[PDB]
Design a protein around this ligand. Structure first.
Ligand SMILES: [Ca+2]
Lengths: 102, 46
């Protein structure tokens, strides 16, 4: 998470796919962003200290592989939000908070 | 009881015939859970 003046880096445990004996619980990208940064939940949106870090209020950056995974899983999903993909063990999500926002 | 010659928590008849690991316990290989993702290993029982 890059708020602009300070950066916060986190690792969140994700499950390995081709494995029956990997019982690491499943969470979405929104729940993982909420946990990793202890963000507050205002009704429906996700707030950092005093900044909105929801999917719309920030610019999301990924590498090629994470973007491809997120896209091909947005196809097979309804209610299409990036914060609903399921955090597949090797993602490189980079939230960037904008300078000015309305 | 099942025999374990090399003392590594896998019975002798499992290491020579086929086994897999379920819930951190070695179980005999039944062929029907190859589509649950479970792989079948063999190793030296000595
Ligand atoms: Ca043994």
């Amino acid at each position: 998470l890059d708020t602009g003046s300070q950066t916060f880096e986190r690792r969140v445990a994700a499950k390995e796919q081709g494995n029956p004996e990997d019982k690491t619980p499943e969470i979405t990208i929104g729940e993982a962003i909420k946990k990793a940064f202890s963000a507050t939940k205002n009704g429906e949106l996700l707030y950092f200290n005093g900044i909105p870090i929801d999917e719309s209020c920030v610019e999301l950056i990924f590498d090629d592989n994470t973007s491809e995974i997120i896209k091909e899983q947005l196809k097979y999903l309804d209610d299409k939000k990036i914060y609903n993909v399921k955090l597949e063990r090797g993602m490189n999500i980079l939230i960037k908070v904008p300078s000015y926002f309305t | 009881e099942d025999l374990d010659t090399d003392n590594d928590n896998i019975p002798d008849a499992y290491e020579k015939n086929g086994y897999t690991i379920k819930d951190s316990i070695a179980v005999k290989w039944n062929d029907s859970f190859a589509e649950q993702g479970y792989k079948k290993y063999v190793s030296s029982y000595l």
